[PDB]
Design a binder for this molecule. Structure first.
Ligand SMILES: [Zn+2]
Length: 7
């Protein structure tokens, strides 16, 4: 699956 990190 797909991953996003929003710092
Ligand atoms: Zn994946």
């Amino acid at each position: 699956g797909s991953n996003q990190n929003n710092f």
